[PDB]
């Protein structure tokens, strides 16, 4: 759209799309809990593993704060504080041309659980499999794609706040998610607040031969993060 501006959260450099429509989760802004507040140190853009959107792809998914566990300062506070809360400015850009055709679906599922009608026992999946870090996870046609990986017919996946990266429109996704949970503060280590999933709405089709697939990018910034009780400084 032109005239795009960069924002530097001290260390991080952006250069957005421009602005072209952003999304606020239930029209709410992240505000302080009414503690250890890092501010700029842990409230600065971190870039996750850029993944490859291929014809064959089923989708991708990440947990918050899980992904950003291995993220410098934010991750320290996270590991060094028993009690903790935060917000996130999800920014998923995917650049292609006027010779590519498809539609990306980025959803924000508070408590994004996956599979098992064994309500009797959930979590089941192992701690490591439930927390795949920055590298991320993928749906399969077990996160059954058309059931949001969770037994629920995807056609409704639009309940959660979302934007559609339609190739021929905006080549970006901008999602703001204030802190959601029953608790006022939380065990960041153990509990995942949000679930950023990105599934194909329209498939990837490219003209003749060009880019045999294209790339999608997740850089997210923590929004007003705080924590309770500084535990042992384990180095």
């Amino acid at each position: 759209s032109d005239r795009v501006l960069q924002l530097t959260l001290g260390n991080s450099t952006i250069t957005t799309q421009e602005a072209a429509n952003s999304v606020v989760a239930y029209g709410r802004w992240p505000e302080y809990l009414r503690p250890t507040e890092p501010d700029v140190a842990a409230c600065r853009f971190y870039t996750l593993d850029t993944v490859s959107w291929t014809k064959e792809s089923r989708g991708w998914w990440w947990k918050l704060p899980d992904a950003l566990r291995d993220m410098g300062l934010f991750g320290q506070n996270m590991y060094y504080h028993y009690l903790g809360r935060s917000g996130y400015t999800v920014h998923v850009q995917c650049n292609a041309s006027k010779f590519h055709q498809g539609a990306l679906g980025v959803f924000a599922v508070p408590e994004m659980c996956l599979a098992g009608d064994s309500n009797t026992t959930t979590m089941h999946t192992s701690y490591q499999n439930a927390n795949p870090g920055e590298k991320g996870g993928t749906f399969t046609g077990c996160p059954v794609d058309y059931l949001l990986g969770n037994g629920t017919l995807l056609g409704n996946a639009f309940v959660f706040p979302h934007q559609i990266i339609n190739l021929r429109t905006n080549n970006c996704a901008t999602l703001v998610l204030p802190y959601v949970n029953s608790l006022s503060i939380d065990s960041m280590v153990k509990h995942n607040n949000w679930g950023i999933a990105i599934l194909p709405l329209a498939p990837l089709n490219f003209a003749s031969e060009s880019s045999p697939e294209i790339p999608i990018t997740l850089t997210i910034a923590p929004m007003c993060c705080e924590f309770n009780g500084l535990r042992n400084i384990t180095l």
């Binding site: 947990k63 994004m112 659980c113 037994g151 017919l153 409704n156 959601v180 153990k190």
Partner: protein, 191 residues
């Protein structure tokens, strides 16, 4: 014009959650022994469950109604005087009873209600007894173990009678003053 449609009337229904069975045998039957114990959940049923599951978070004053009907199991002309059933509501985290005998059964804390058969059904209410600010119908991660509203306990208060009287506790729940946060697409199929 939108009314009956609102939350306070989406759940303003008295739906069964469980059906528990007791007995008053003179014989030794430790299986369905006098006591009945059931974990207060919505999880057992279907109708009420899907309804709540439209959302991820909730707060509701939890009322319960206990209609109790009985009968004589053995084909005998035997008799029985009208009975009483102590309904023990147990708030989450307490000692759960077994043998209808134990100390717990005297509680001095737990609210319990004695009812005399053949009248207006049993009724109580437990306000938002959430350990959090909301009841999360779903919770992603590791500690499934839901929230726990406690456990319901009923036994025959009257002593052993030559003629064995079997009863049932139909439990209904009206979640008065309910509030919900962030909806999910509802469960497509069955559980």
């Amino acid at each position: 014009s939108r009314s009956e449609s609102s939350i306070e009337s989406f759940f303003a229904r008295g739906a069964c959650v469980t059906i528990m069975t007791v007995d008053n045998p003179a014989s030794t039957t430790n299986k369905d022994k006098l006591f009945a114990v059931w974990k207060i959940t919505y999880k057992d049923t279907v109708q009420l469950r899907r309804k709540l599951e439209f959302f991820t978070y909730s707060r509701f004053d939890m009322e319960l109604t206990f209609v109790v009907t009985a009968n004589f199991t053995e084909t005998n002309n035997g008799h029985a005087l009208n009975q009483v059933y102590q309904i023990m509501y147990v708030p989450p985290g307490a000692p759960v009873p077994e043998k209808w005998d134990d100390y717990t059964w005297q509680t001095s804390s737990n609210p319990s209600i004695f009812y005399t058969y053949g009248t207006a059904p049993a009724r109580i209410s437990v306000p938002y007894v959430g350990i959090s600010n909301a009841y999360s119908h779903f919770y992603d991660g590791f500690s499934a173990s839901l929230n726990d509203f406690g456990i319901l306990a009923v036994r025959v208060v009257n002593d052993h009678n030559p003629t064995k009287v079997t009863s049932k506790i139909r439990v209904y729940l009206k979640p008065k003053h309910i509030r919900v946060w962030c909806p999910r697409p509802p469960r497509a199929v069955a559980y």
